[PDB]
Amino acid sequence: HGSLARAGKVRGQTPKVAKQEKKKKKTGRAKRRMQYNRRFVNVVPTFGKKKGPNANS
Amino acid sequence: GKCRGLRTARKLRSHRRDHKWHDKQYKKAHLGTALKANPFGGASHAKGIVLEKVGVEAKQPNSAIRKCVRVQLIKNGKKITAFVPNDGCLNFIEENDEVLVAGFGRKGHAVGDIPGVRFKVVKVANVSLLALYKGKKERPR
Amino acid sequence: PVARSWVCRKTYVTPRRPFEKSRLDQELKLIGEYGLRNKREVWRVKFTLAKIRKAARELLTLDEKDPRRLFEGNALLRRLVRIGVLDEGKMKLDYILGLKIEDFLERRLQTQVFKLGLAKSIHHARVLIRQRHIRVRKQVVNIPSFIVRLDSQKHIDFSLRSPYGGGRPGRVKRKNAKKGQGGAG
Amino acid sequence: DTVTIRTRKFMTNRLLQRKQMVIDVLHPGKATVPKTEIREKLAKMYKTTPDVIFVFGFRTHFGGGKTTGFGMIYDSLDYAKKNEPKHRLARHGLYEKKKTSRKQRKERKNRMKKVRGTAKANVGAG
RNA sequence: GGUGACCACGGGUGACGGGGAAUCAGGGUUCGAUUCCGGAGAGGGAGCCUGAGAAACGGCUACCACAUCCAAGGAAGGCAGCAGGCGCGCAAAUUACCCACUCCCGACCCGGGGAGGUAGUGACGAAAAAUAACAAUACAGGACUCUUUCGAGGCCCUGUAAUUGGAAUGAGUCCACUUUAAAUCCUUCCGCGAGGAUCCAUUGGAGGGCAAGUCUGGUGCCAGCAGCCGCGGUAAUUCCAGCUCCAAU
Ligand SMILES: [Mg+2]
Ligand SMILES: [Mg+2]
Ligand SMILES: [Mg+2]
Ligand SMILES: [Mg+2]
Ligand SMILES: [Mg+2]
Ligand SMILES: [Mg+2]
Ligand SMILES: [Mg+2]
Ligand SMILES: [Mg+2]
Ligand SMILES: [Mg+2]
Ligand SMILES: [Mg+2]
């Protein structure tokens, strides 16, 4: 059985959005500098019960 | 226990020999059957013609219709169901269109739901679903 | 049939337990601590050291006073002092084992650019070396990860043919000079 | 002004009727050297005229401070048009070869078997 | 008479044999059609000449199996040499240039060599390795010093921005040279060639195994996801989207 009408229902009706543009992200070896720097030497503040590197506030 | 002796290199070899036709993973590989049975004649992928589009009903705990393709392989003329992966891609594939069907990753096991479907479609008229469902390469005409 | 070479073999090994965290959190330090190109570049040095340590360990199974141990040992030790890792004639083998990555990093060219003032921040070094600014001895060196022979430490110096060092100010200063002569004057 | 052509590994090849050595050309920021200049500057060197000096090899290496290579010297042009290979004489206008070009030869010489021995037809050729 | 469970004899192989390969705590396990050695076959067999030397296929003799031209009497066919095409196929290069290197045959220093080298194609694969750096600001901070703290001196720092700023370089392009055989390619260098809106890094992921958001839209047991565990039935940490992050890069 089964109606094959519903193939691509969801991509179909999800309202598309623009992908924006700001920063051409730094790459290669500078990326990795920015990386270490931003979670090793720099901030390393008074601990706030573990981190959340991509978490919310 | 084991035979353990010093001129017992054979009773041992010949012991550890036959007590592999009780392994499962070798009796696929070394017997014959596999090469004889799998429509994919020992071959990673294979080409075949889309003869119709068929929805399959998933295994109870997860209700849904899976959206696969009855294929007939060129080399054998052996038929197949292949689940066309990723959303709304069955919409792309039309009848009688030449598809490159690869496995599922379980090598013979059917994957998860999709009861009794080993194969997944990859290409369609020398394109690749990954390019179509991203909208990079369009349908040929 | 043809002429040609083959004998191409990898310089590295990827880790098994593919992302431990602990392992990542070490191997990142190393990349920043010394301005490394990439992650692989660690597991280059990681793979090279593991050779040495297994070469050494190969010898520690042999009985002493045995023609190989003595020969291969000296040869191997010399090769390390030669590049400036074991010191002064530490040269008796067991010691090799007690030795870590930090070392074959500290003796890369890149590090020994700012270690000898020259650069000004670790990444200058890797730029400066690529930019064909610095030389060794007489050859102008392009490569960051050239392990520097201990002998050839004092001969790292600003190239004779580069802007700082002397001769031909680079095209940026040549253009903003010609803006003052041609554009302004 | 700044070239300074220093040689290495000179051998007096009695039996090829020659003198032969590694040319070591220094050169600063100025780029390579051409083989004409090097011949004339290696001529007054050993005092044999430029005519009788043949140079190939020349391979520069980073920085452009230095370029190695091989050059060499016969005791007369008469011998050089004898011991030396074609390419090095043809390098400068003294001895050139035919331009039939390989597949013209082959297409011809696989005929002239078809014909028997009537020279007229073999001369017919292509 | 000879051989046999110390397994013969029979059958099979996705079997040309070695030298090695990737795997690998020690021991194995599978692969080795793969350039080096050894064997075999030139559609298939058989027989043949000729030859020291061949049962020789860039010989021929039939047959079988293939196939070309035709004036219908007859004639010429062998890529498992190199190129190329067709078919097969998941699955693989140019009707390229040349004897300059290594070597070989000749009567021979002199010709020829698709043996061979050189270009082209070429994410089969391996090595190195750009995709930015730095000063001053504006700040955003945090070990000396100073301050009860708030503040400040500042040797330390680092975050984003202004790019404020010039310096440095290569990817390109292209005078010139080398190379080579002639190139090409590489190495050398004159001359031009970086302010992002550029000279623009992607692929998978983001519940766990497993490094990474109960961030925000939409759907609502559908579509769909999910190697396994699973999610989806009206706030989905799981679908389709957006923004952020992570891994290698
Ligand atoms: Mg068979
Ligand atoms: Mg054939
Ligand atoms: Mg034969
Ligand atoms: Mg025969
Ligand atoms: Mg042939
Ligand atoms: Mg392939
Ligand atoms: Mg060839
Ligand atoms: Mg690679
Ligand atoms: Mg780039
Ligand atoms: Mg996970």
PDB file of all heavy atoms in Angstrom, chain D residues 7-20:
ATOM      1  N   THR D   7      85.912  25.812 -11.117  1.00  0.00           N
ATOM      2  CA  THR D   7      85.718  24.459 -11.636  1.00  0.00           C
ATOM      3  C   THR D   7      86.098  23.407 -10.609  1.00  0.00           C
ATOM      4  O   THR D   7      86.872  23.672  -9.687  1.00  0.00           O
ATOM      5  CB  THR D   7      86.552  24.208 -12.907  1.00  0.00           C
ATOM      6  OG1 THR D   7      87.943  24.428 -12.627  1.00  0.00           O
ATOM      7  CG2 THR D   7      86.095  25.126 -14.034  1.00  0.00           C
ATOM      8  N   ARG D   8      85.541  22.213 -10.793  1.00  0.00           N
ATOM      9  CA  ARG D   8      85.852  21.044  -9.978  1.00  0.00           C
ATOM     10  C   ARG D   8      86.092  19.842 -10.863  1.00  0.00           C
ATOM     11  O   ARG D   8      85.445  19.684 -11.895  1.00  0.00           O
ATOM     12  CB  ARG D   8      84.665  20.677  -9.104  1.00  0.00           C
ATOM     13  CG  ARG D   8      84.379  21.556  -7.914  1.00  0.00           C
ATOM     14  CD  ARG D   8      83.180  20.974  -7.177  1.00  0.00           C
ATOM     15  NE  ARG D   8      81.928  21.413  -7.788  1.00  0.00           N
ATOM     16  CZ  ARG D   8      80.719  21.261  -7.251  1.00  0.00           C
ATOM     17  NH1 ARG D   8      80.552  20.650  -6.074  1.00  0.00           N
ATOM     18  NH2 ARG D   8      79.659  21.739  -7.896  1.00  0.00           N
ATOM     19  N   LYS D   9      86.993  18.976 -10.423  1.00  0.00           N
ATOM     20  CA  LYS D   9      87.064  17.618 -10.929  1.00  0.00           C
ATOM     21  C   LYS D   9      87.479  17.616 -12.391  1.00  0.00           C
ATOM     22  O   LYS D   9      86.752  17.161 -13.272  1.00  0.00           O
ATOM     23  CB  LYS D   9      85.726  16.883 -10.688  1.00  0.00           C
ATOM     24  CG  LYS D   9      85.299  16.873  -9.218  1.00  0.00           C
ATOM     25  CD  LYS D   9      83.849  16.452  -8.983  1.00  0.00           C
ATOM     26  CE  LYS D   9      83.677  14.935  -9.008  1.00  0.00           C
ATOM     27  NZ  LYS D   9      82.420  14.496  -8.350  1.00  0.00           N
ATOM     28  N   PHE D  10      88.673  18.142 -12.618  1.00  0.00           N
ATOM     29  CA  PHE D  10      89.248  18.251 -13.944  1.00  0.00           C
ATOM     30  C   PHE D  10      89.944  16.957 -14.235  1.00  0.00           C
ATOM     31  O   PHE D  10      90.628  16.408 -13.371  1.00  0.00           O
ATOM     32  CB  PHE D  10      90.265  19.371 -13.941  1.00  0.00           C
ATOM     33  CG  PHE D  10      90.558  20.017 -15.283  1.00  0.00           C
ATOM     34  CD1 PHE D  10      89.594  20.728 -15.991  1.00  0.00           C
ATOM     35  CD2 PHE D  10      91.851  20.055 -15.757  1.00  0.00           C
ATOM     36  CE1 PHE D  10      89.897  21.390 -17.175  1.00  0.00           C
ATOM     37  CE2 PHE D  10      92.175  20.723 -16.935  1.00  0.00           C
ATOM     38  CZ  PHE D  10      91.196  21.394 -17.644  1.00  0.00           C
ATOM     39  N   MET D  11      89.766  16.473 -15.455  1.00  0.00           N
ATOM     40  CA  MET D  11      90.423  15.272 -15.895  1.00  0.00           C
ATOM     41  C   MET D  11      90.955  15.486 -17.293  1.00  0.00           C
ATOM     42  O   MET D  11      90.273  16.061 -18.144  1.00  0.00           O
ATOM     43  CB  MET D  11      89.433  14.136 -15.877  1.00  0.00           C
ATOM     44  CG  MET D  11      90.084  12.773 -15.961  1.00  0.00           C
ATOM     45  SD  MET D  11      88.833  11.489 -16.111  1.00  0.00           S
ATOM     46  CE  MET D  11      87.770  11.857 -14.709  1.00  0.00           C
ATOM     47  N   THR D  12      92.177  15.027 -17.512  1.00  0.00           N
ATOM     48  CA  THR D  12      92.816  15.112 -18.810  1.00  0.00           C
ATOM     49  C   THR D  12      92.570  13.800 -19.530  1.00  0.00           C
ATOM     50  O   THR D  12      93.361  12.862 -19.428  1.00  0.00           O
ATOM     51  CB  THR D  12      94.325  15.382 -18.666  1.00  0.00           C
ATOM     52  OG1 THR D  12      94.874  14.521 -17.655  1.00  0.00           O
ATOM     53  CG2 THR D  12      94.581  16.849 -18.283  1.00  0.00           C
ATOM     54  N   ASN D  13      91.456  13.745 -20.248  1.00  0.00           N
ATOM     55  CA  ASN D  13      91.064  12.553 -20.997  1.00  0.00           C
ATOM     56  C   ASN D  13      91.883  12.420 -22.259  1.00  0.00           C
ATOM     57  O   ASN D  13      91.446  12.785 -23.354  1.00  0.00           O
ATOM     58  CB  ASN D  13      89.563  12.580 -21.334  1.00  0.00           C
ATOM     59  CG  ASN D  13      88.710  11.806 -20.343  1.00  0.00           C
ATOM     60  OD1 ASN D  13      89.213  11.007 -19.555  1.00  0.00           O
ATOM     61  ND2 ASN D  13      87.400  12.045 -20.389  1.00  0.00           N
ATOM     62  N   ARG D  14      93.090  11.898 -22.077  1.00  0.00           N
ATOM     63  CA  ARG D  14      93.983  11.570 -23.182  1.00  0.00           C
ATOM     64  C   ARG D  14      93.218  10.911 -24.308  1.00  0.00           C
ATOM     65  O   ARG D  14      93.383  11.305 -25.456  1.00  0.00           O
ATOM     66  CB  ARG D  14      95.087  10.589 -22.722  1.00  0.00           C
ATOM     67  CG  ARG D  14      96.438  11.138 -22.264  1.00  0.00           C
ATOM     68  CD  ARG D  14      96.408  12.563 -21.765  1.00  0.00           C
ATOM     69  NE  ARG D  14      96.644  13.519 -22.849  1.00  0.00           N
ATOM     70  CZ  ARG D  14      97.837  13.788 -23.388  1.00  0.00           C
ATOM     71  NH1 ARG D  14      98.949  13.166 -22.970  1.00  0.00           N
ATOM     72  NH2 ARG D  14      97.925  14.693 -24.362  1.00  0.00           N
ATOM     73  N   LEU D  15      92.379   9.930 -23.960  1.00  0.00           N
ATOM     74  CA  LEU D  15      91.824   8.969 -24.930  1.00  0.00           C
ATOM     75  C   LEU D  15      90.471   9.345 -25.534  1.00  0.00           C
ATOM     76  O   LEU D  15      90.006   8.677 -26.464  1.00  0.00           O
ATOM     77  CB  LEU D  15      91.794   7.542 -24.347  1.00  0.00           C
ATOM     78  CG  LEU D  15      91.202   7.267 -22.960  1.00  0.00           C
ATOM     79  CD1 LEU D  15      89.827   7.906 -22.799  1.00  0.00           C
ATOM     80  CD2 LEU D  15      91.138   5.767 -22.694  1.00  0.00           C
ATOM     81  N   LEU D  16      89.844  10.399 -25.022  1.00  0.00           N
ATOM     82  CA  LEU D  16      88.804  11.091 -25.782  1.00  0.00           C
ATOM     83  C   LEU D  16      89.300  12.442 -26.323  1.00  0.00           C
ATOM     84  O   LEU D  16      88.534  13.179 -26.944  1.00  0.00           O
ATOM     85  CB  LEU D  16      87.539  11.251 -24.943  1.00  0.00           C
ATOM     86  CG  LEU D  16      86.553  10.073 -24.867  1.00  0.00           C
ATOM     87  CD1 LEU D  16      85.573  10.295 -23.723  1.00  0.00           C
ATOM     88  CD2 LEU D  16      85.791   9.852 -26.173  1.00  0.00           C
ATOM     89  N   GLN D  17      90.581  12.748 -26.093  1.00  0.00           N
ATOM     90  CA  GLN D  17      91.272  13.910 -26.675  1.00  0.00           C
ATOM     91  C   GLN D  17      90.690  15.181 -26.045  1.00  0.00           C
ATOM     92  O   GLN D  17      90.372  16.138 -26.755  1.00  0.00           O
ATOM     93  CB  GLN D  17      91.181  13.923 -28.231  1.00  0.00           C
ATOM     94  CG  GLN D  17      91.298  12.572 -28.990  1.00  0.00           C
ATOM     95  CD  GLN D  17      92.201  11.602 -28.271  1.00  0.00           C
ATOM     96  OE1 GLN D  17      91.729  10.834 -27.450  1.00  0.00           O
ATOM     97  NE2 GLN D  17      93.506  11.680 -28.510  1.00  0.00           N
ATOM     98  N   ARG D  18      90.558  15.178 -24.707  1.00  0.00           N
ATOM     99  CA  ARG D  18      89.782  16.214 -23.972  1.00  0.00           C
ATOM    100  C   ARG D  18      90.213  16.592 -22.548  1.00  0.00           C
ATOM    101  O   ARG D  18      90.944  15.869 -21.874  1.00  0.00           O
ATOM    102  CB  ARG D  18      88.271  15.885 -23.941  1.00  0.00           C
ATOM    103  CG  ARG D  18      87.828  14.433 -24.114  1.00  0.00           C
ATOM    104  CD  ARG D  18      86.740  13.976 -23.141  1.00  0.00           C
ATOM    105  NE  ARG D  18      85.371  14.385 -23.451  1.00  0.00           N
ATOM    106  CZ  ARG D  18      84.282  13.827 -22.923  1.00  0.00           C
ATOM    107  NH1 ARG D  18      84.355  12.844 -22.019  1.00  0.00           N
ATOM    108  NH2 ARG D  18      83.090  14.284 -23.278  1.00  0.00           N
ATOM    109  N   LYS D  19      89.726  17.762 -22.139  1.00  0.00           N
ATOM    110  CA  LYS D  19      89.782  18.253 -20.766  1.00  0.00           C
ATOM    111  C   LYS D  19      88.339  18.400 -20.333  1.00  0.00           C
ATOM    112  O   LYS D  19      87.550  18.998 -21.070  1.00  0.00           O
ATOM    113  CB  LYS D  19      90.437  19.638 -20.691  1.00  0.00           C
ATOM    114  CG  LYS D  19      91.751  19.803 -21.438  1.00  0.00           C
ATOM    115  CD  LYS D  19      92.871  19.003 -20.792  1.00  0.00           C
ATOM    116  CE  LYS D  19      94.176  19.175 -21.558  1.00  0.00           C
ATOM    117  NZ  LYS D  19      95.235  18.205 -21.155  1.00  0.00           N
ATOM    118  N   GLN D  20      87.982  17.883 -19.154  1.00  0.00           N
ATOM    119  CA  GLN D  20      86.572  17.899 -18.716  1.00  0.00           C
ATOM    120  C   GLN D  20      86.350  18.012 -17.215  1.00  0.00           C
ATOM    121  O   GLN D  20      86.927  17.251 -16.433  1.00  0.00           O
ATOM    122  CB  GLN D  20      85.809  16.689 -19.279  1.00  0.00           C
ATOM    123  CG  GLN D  20      86.444  15.306 -19.104  1.00  0.00           C
ATOM    124  CD  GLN D  20      85.597  14.342 -18.287  1.00  0.00           C
ATOM    125  OE1 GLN D  20      84.367  14.374 -18.334  1.00  0.00           O
ATOM    126  NE2 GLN D  20      86.254  13.476 -17.535  1.00  0.00           N
TER     127      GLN D  20
END
